Design a binder for these strands. Structure first.
Ligand SMILES: [Mg+2]
Ligand SMILES: [Mg+2]
Ligand SMILES: [Mg+2]
Ligand SMILES: [Mg+2]
Ligand SMILES: [Mg+2]
Ligand SMILES: [Mg+2]
Ligand SMILES: [Mg+2]
Ligand SMILES: [Mg+2]
Ligand SMILES: [Mg+2]
Ligand SMILES: [Mg+2]
Ligand SMILES: [Mg+2]
Ligand SMILES: [Mg+2]
Ligand SMILES: [Mg+2]
Ligand SMILES: [Mg+2]
Ligand SMILES: [Mg+2]
Ligand SMILES: [Mg+2]
Ligand SMILES: [Mg+2]
Ligand SMILES: [Mg+2]
Ligand SMILES: [Mg+2]
Ligand SMILES: [Mg+2]
Ligand SMILES: [Mg+2]
Ligand SMILES: [Mg+2]
Ligand SMILES: [Mg+2]
Ligand SMILES: [Mg+2]
Ligand SMILES: [Mg+2]
Ligand SMILES: [Mg+2]
Ligand SMILES: [Mg+2]
Ligand SMILES: [Mg+2]
Ligand SMILES: [Mg+2]
Ligand SMILES: [Mg+2]
Ligand SMILES: [Mg+2]
Ligand SMILES: [Mg+2]
Ligand SMILES: [Mg+2]
Ligand SMILES: [Mg+2]
Ligand SMILES: [Mg+2]
Ligand SMILES: [Mg+2]
Ligand SMILES: [Mg+2]
Ligand SMILES: [Mg+2]
Ligand SMILES: [Mg+2]
Ligand SMILES: [Mg+2]
Ligand SMILES: [Mg+2]
Ligand SMILES: [Mg+2]
Ligand SMILES: [Mg+2]
Ligand SMILES: [Mg+2]
Ligand SMILES: [Mg+2]
Ligand SMILES: [Mg+2]
Ligand SMILES: [Mg+2]
Ligand SMILES: [Mg+2]
Ligand SMILES: [Mg+2]
Ligand SMILES: [Mg+2]
Ligand SMILES: [Mg+2]
Ligand SMILES: [Mg+2]
Ligand SMILES: [Mg+2]
Ligand SMILES: [Mg+2]
Ligand SMILES: [Mg+2]
Ligand SMILES: [Mg+2]
Ligand SMILES: [Mg+2]
Ligand SMILES: [Mg+2]
Ligand SMILES: [Mg+2]
Ligand SMILES: [Mg+2]
Ligand SMILES: [Mg+2]
Ligand SMILES: [Mg+2]
Ligand SMILES: [Mg+2]
Ligand SMILES: [Mg+2]
Ligand SMILES: [Mg+2]
Ligand SMILES: [Mg+2]
Lengths: 185, 172, 159, 48, 58
RNA sequence: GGUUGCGGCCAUAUCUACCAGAAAGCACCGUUUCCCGUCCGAUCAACUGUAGUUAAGCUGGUAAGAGCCUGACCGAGUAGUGUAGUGGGUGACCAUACGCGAAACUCAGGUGCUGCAAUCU
RNA sequence: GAGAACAGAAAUCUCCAGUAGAACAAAAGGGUAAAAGCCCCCUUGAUUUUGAUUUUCAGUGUGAAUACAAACCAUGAAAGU
RNA sequence: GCCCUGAAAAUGGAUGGCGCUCAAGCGUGUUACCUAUACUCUACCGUCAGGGUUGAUAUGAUGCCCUGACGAGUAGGCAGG
RNA sequence: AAAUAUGUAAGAAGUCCUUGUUACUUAAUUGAACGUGGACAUUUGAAUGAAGAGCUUUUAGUGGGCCAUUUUUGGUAAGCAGAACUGGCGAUGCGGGAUGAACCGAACGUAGAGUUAAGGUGCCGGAAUACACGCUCAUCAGACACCACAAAAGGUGUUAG
RNA sequence: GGAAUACUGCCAGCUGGGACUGAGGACUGCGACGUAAGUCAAGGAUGCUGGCAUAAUGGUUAUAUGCCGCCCGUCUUGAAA
RNA sequence: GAAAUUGUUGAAAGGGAAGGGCAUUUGAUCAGACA
């Protein structure tokens, strides 16, 4: 036998295709695992993985988060890639030109982009123009802005929000939530 | 412990700045191999001086061969041993043809008569009893009487097949 | 039934060192601490205020704070299968600067030297540490020192 | 680097046997374990 | 019926599966419970130097 | 080198007996109007530095001195101890193998080192 | 220990030795000598505000405790506490 | 040291049984020999891992090809059927 | 005053120079903290290993334990009761100890060839009625760890001292 | 004085007997021998010969024989109980 | 028109249970492949 020093038959724990069942998604993956095998360009390698990402690890990048990234020094002409949906954002009043390459554009976003005379490209059109991902600026959305993660790590002195249905005074604000009622948190 | 060789072992207290060239001690050691021999050396040495292997060095190991390996000899043997209930000095006499044969059967004898295993025995001295009549134990003296002869009565020949067609005979 | 108060089990831990009771000598107070200093901890039983708990006796930690009569020491204490961060408010009588680093610091200062001393000569350095190598060959002489031969000794009783 | 490159050798049990009737005492005590010095080649060869 | 009272048996086996995690270290730890007089000044200090490294890019 | 004032390490500085100490300094020492404290100007306060003394303090040296400090293959690789065996022994216990290793003992050497400022034949 | 009328084993007075062999509410163990013990003097910080920390720990609560911040005070020539 | 005495229990009975006495017993040594799901080499299965391969004009891209290591299992989890 | 255990440290989050910030702090631009600018690369600072490392969520069963060596408390003691560290059994078959949860050896995919472990080799039964030196004769001999018990005390039996 | 020999160790010295295996399926590599052309035991067996062409080999089955094998389910520290 | 369970017929085995595992003999029985 072998004094093992490591758990045997361990799965690497990384998605290795998407769990998604979409033809088109699978084709984009067909495209990119080819590019990733034959182009030593790191970008293709990153994109291939992002396609496997479940909906949660794909938060929506906004058009305003897009516009900001372009105010990066020396970055205003880059084509931003977003492996996920791209949402609109009325809060920005002035939007740049550029070229966003993404999985989905909401109606409002694709308009705002095109209204200022930009381009909305699908990832495969992106490939044909930038097979080594040249001149691309990859953005990801806020993963930990999810409502769920509020409640992660709930316990004393952690400050994390009860899993609670109804809220108001007299919903979990008394004994153990204030010095004058037993104790606090 | 097996079939012994005799070794001169030499060791000496690892040198130091204020004492380069420490003093060098020798032991003759009956062991079956040089590895056991070096062990035994350190064993008795820490029983005599302030050293241990850690802080000391074996300097030279050499097998000593019998001087006259086909000369019959009367060996006086001195031993320290542990019994179940105490420890005991003791003198035996062994007749053989080399100090190495002699120590083989001593260990044999000590084991057979006193139930002494190797761990529990200490050779004090083995030396050739030169002049007969300084031989003291009878079971040896017996074999010095002039013109010695004896029969070897009741001969048992080993059969090589299971069955025999004769009925044997122990004439000899 | 059982008892488990704060200084329980500490009879000889906090106890005072033979012939060394009394005032603490003044240098214990002239010593000076800054954040990041590594300190070893040992309780002075004569100083009851601001005293480490026994678990931190014998323990080494890093300074994180300095107050009028005290320093704050962080220690990692492992509770469970995990360490947690502990902050200790100690009075200066229970802390001393650690030497646990003096060999490092001395070695860096020197490693910087042997390097400059090398570099601006013609390289060849070798300044990592190395374990005890086994020793080399050697010729021991007999001249003045022939081997003395010992044997083992008989049983005796002196008593 | 040279020695780590070498994957741990995998010997068979000794052909001649072990010497000894019990392995788990020290060489010096008639056993098999420990430093047995130059007698390591006799063994390893019988297992290689 | 009485029953066992206490043991540590098997407890370090358990602690070692996932293994006594080394304590984890950060550059820039927290000032938690650091002297407030110090911390108050430290504030206005950092304000100033920041401002003087905004001056640097005027 | 001495001595003072403030020290650091806090007996190689402590303890017992005895002798020696130039110069300066400390000291003992004189006084009771004043601030001040006492049963008591002994302590403590003040005033003189004058009227006196090395007696004590202090400093140093002596002692097969007590103590304390150091060292050593002195005792001892001893006691004890991590590790091994389908080792011994009815047991109590004990050897052995690879390691770590005391304390007492005994013998020798020692008996304050030193920082800042002032002062001194 | 040695000394002083009544005065004795033990009253009160003095000197010498005294590493704590005493005392410090209480159990016991730590600790302490120009004090932490004994006598005296002045006092209320045993107060106000709200956090951090250590023990027990789930790193919850409670008890107890620690070092600071912001007050107002006490004492002391003062450093301080 | 071995042996003997010290040495008393209940159905007939256990060095495992037979039986063994210069042992087939006790102490010790030296060889050889027997045989585990263990070790070495090899085939096949499965698991995990690392490579390679969309180029049409034929058949699985969850595919095809190369290479390496690993395989006990209650309660229990998950997976492919 | 040990041995075994035990805290920290062995660098880029490092070392050195220059001299900014503040309401803290100093007699003092003195310090303290945080910085800007500059000097030095993998012998960049011990060993060995590393089927990589870090991180997050959620949930089962479990919450009667028992054994062995060593340390160890109560008890005359217990196949008794209670702790310490590890290794086990529980959850596990395989070879050995005739037998047997826990001892020894060794941990398991389906198989061939080899070699071994622990344990054996008169016959049961694979394997020397092998070699070698002693010892032992029992009118209740003895015969292999855990283990299935024997003691004080004696023998002019015999052995060696 | 001069040899031998034992013992231990080395040889990329030669050489006999015996057993199991023969995965892979054009070529591709690293080589070896040769003046050369070639050849080879160098990234996994081929050559030659015979017998049968069927219950012969093989499967299934019943029996016999060697060694082995306790009744499952369960609760339990522990069940063939 | 299953099973437990039964009668008959045929074949086998059986010294205090039977059934099971590895393996082969023996009987019975059978697929494939040859060309
Ligand atoms: Mg929100
Ligand atoms: Mg509270
Ligand atoms: Mg000779
Ligand atoms: Mg108690
Ligand atoms: Mg004192
Ligand atoms: Mg208090
Ligand atoms: Mg061989
Ligand atoms: Mg063989
Ligand atoms: Mg052979
Ligand atoms: Mg054996
Ligand atoms: Mg081989
Ligand atoms: Mg109950
Ligand atoms: Mg119970
Ligand atoms: Mg319980
Ligand atoms: Mg004078
Ligand atoms: Mg008056
Ligand atoms: Mg006066
Ligand atoms: Mg005065
Ligand atoms: Mg005088
Ligand atoms: Mg004086
Ligand atoms: Mg003296
Ligand atoms: Mg030990
Ligand atoms: Mg073992
Ligand atoms: Mg034992
Ligand atoms: Mg002893
Ligand atoms: Mg008390
Ligand atoms: Mg005082
Ligand atoms: Mg109160
Ligand atoms: Mg509660
Ligand atoms: Mg029996
Ligand atoms: Mg038998
Ligand atoms: Mg025998
Ligand atoms: Mg197998
Ligand atoms: Mg294999
Ligand atoms: Mg499995
Ligand atoms: Mg497993
Ligand atoms: Mg350690
Ligand atoms: Mg490595
Ligand atoms: Mg790796
Ligand atoms: Mg859970
Ligand atoms: Mg749970
Ligand atoms: Mg639960
Ligand atoms: Mg339960
Ligand atoms: Mg065990
Ligand atoms: Mg259970
Ligand atoms: Mg098992
Ligand atoms: Mg078995
Ligand atoms: Mg048995
Ligand atoms: Mg039989
Ligand atoms: Mg046989
Ligand atoms: Mg033979
Ligand atoms: Mg025994
Ligand atoms: Mg007897
Ligand atoms: Mg006798
Ligand atoms: Mg083939
Ligand atoms: Mg083939
Ligand atoms: Mg035919
Ligand atoms: Mg046919
Ligand atoms: Mg035929
Ligand atoms: Mg059948
Ligand atoms: Mg059976
Ligand atoms: Mg049940
Ligand atoms: Mg029960
Ligand atoms: Mg009908
Ligand atoms: Mg039939
Ligand atoms: Mg069959």
């Amino acid at each position: 036998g072998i004094d093992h020093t490591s758990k045997q038959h361990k799965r690497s724990g990384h998605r290795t295709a998407p769990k998604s069942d979409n033809v088109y998604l699978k084709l984009l993956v067909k495209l990119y695992t080819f590019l990733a095998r034959r182009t030593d360009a790191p970008f293709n390698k990153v994109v291939l993985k992002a396609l496997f990402l479940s909906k949660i690890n794909r938060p929506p990048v906004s058009v305003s988060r897009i516009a900001r990234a372009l105010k990066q020094e020396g970055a205003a002409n880059k084509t931003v890639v977003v492996v996920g949906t791209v949402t609109d954002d009325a809060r920005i009043f002035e939007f740049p030109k550029t070229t966003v390459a993404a999985l989905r554009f909401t109606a409002g976003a694709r308009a705002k982009i095109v209204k200022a005379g930009g381009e909305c490209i699908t990832l495969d059109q992106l490939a044909v123009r930038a097979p080594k991902g040249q001149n691309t600026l990859i953005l990801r959305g806020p993963r930990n802005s999810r409502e769920a993660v509020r409640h992660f790590g709930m316990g004393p002195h952690k400050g994390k929000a009860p899993r609670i249905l109804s809220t108001g005074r007299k919903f979990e604000r008394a004994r153990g939530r204030r010095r004058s009622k037993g104790f606090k948190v | 412990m097996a079939h012994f060789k005799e070794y001169q072992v030499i060791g000496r207290r690892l040198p130091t700045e204020s004492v380069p060239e420490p003093k060098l001690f020798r032991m003759r050691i009956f062991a079956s191999n040089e590895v056991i021999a070096k062990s035994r050396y350190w064993y008795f040495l820490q029983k005599l001086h302030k050293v241990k292997k850690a802080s000391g060095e074996i300097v030279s190991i050499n097998q000593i061969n019998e001087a006259h390996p086909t000369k019959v000899k009367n060996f006086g043997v001195w031993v320290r041993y542990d019994s179940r209930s105490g420890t005991h000095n003791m003198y035996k006499e062994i007749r053989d043809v080399s100090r190495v044969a002699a120590v083989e059967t001593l260990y044999q004898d000590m084991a057979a008569r006193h139930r002494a295993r190797f761990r529990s025995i200490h050779i004090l001295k083995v030396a050739e009893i030169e002049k007969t009549a300084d031989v003291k134990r009878q079971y040896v003296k017996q074999f010095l009487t002039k013109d010695l002869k004896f029969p070897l009565p009741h001969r048992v020949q080993k059969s090589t097949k299971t069955f025999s067609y004769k009925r044997p005979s122990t004439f000899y | 039934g059982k008892s488990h108060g704060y200084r329980s089990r500490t009879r000889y831990m906090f106890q005072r060192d033979f012939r060394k009771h009394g005032a603490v000598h003044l240098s214990t107070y002239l010593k000076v601490y800054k954040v990041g200093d590594i300190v070893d901890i040992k309780a002075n039983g004569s100083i009851q205020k601001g005293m480490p708990h026994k678990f931190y006796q014998g323990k080494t930690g890093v300074v994180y704070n300095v107050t009028k009569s005290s320093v704050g020491v962080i220690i990692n204490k492992m509770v469970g299968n995990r360490y947690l961060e502990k902050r200790l408010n100690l009075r200066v009588e229970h802390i001393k600067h650690s030497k646990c680093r003096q060999e490092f610091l001395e070695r860096v200062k020197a490693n910087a030297a042997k390097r400059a001393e090398a570099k601006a000569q013609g390289v060849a350095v070798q300044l990592k540490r190395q374990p005890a190598q086994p020793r080399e060959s050697r010729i021991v002489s007999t001249e003045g020192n022939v081997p003395q031969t010992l044997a083992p000794v008989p049983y005796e009783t002196f008593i | 680097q040279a020695n780590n490159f070498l994957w741990p050798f995998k010997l068979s049990n000794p052909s001649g046997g072990w010497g000894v009737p019990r392995k788990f005492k020290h060489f010096i005590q008639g056993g098999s374990f420990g430093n047995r010095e130059e007698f390591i080649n006799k063994l390893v060869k019988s297992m290689n | 019926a009485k029953s066992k009272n206490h043991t540590a048996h098997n407890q370090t086996r358990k602690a070692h599966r996932n293994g006594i995690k080394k304590p984890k270290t950060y550059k820039y730890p927290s000032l938690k419970g650091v002297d407030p007089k110090f911390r108050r000044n430290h504030k206005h200090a950092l304000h100033g130097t920041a401002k003087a490294l905004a001056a640097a890019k005027k």
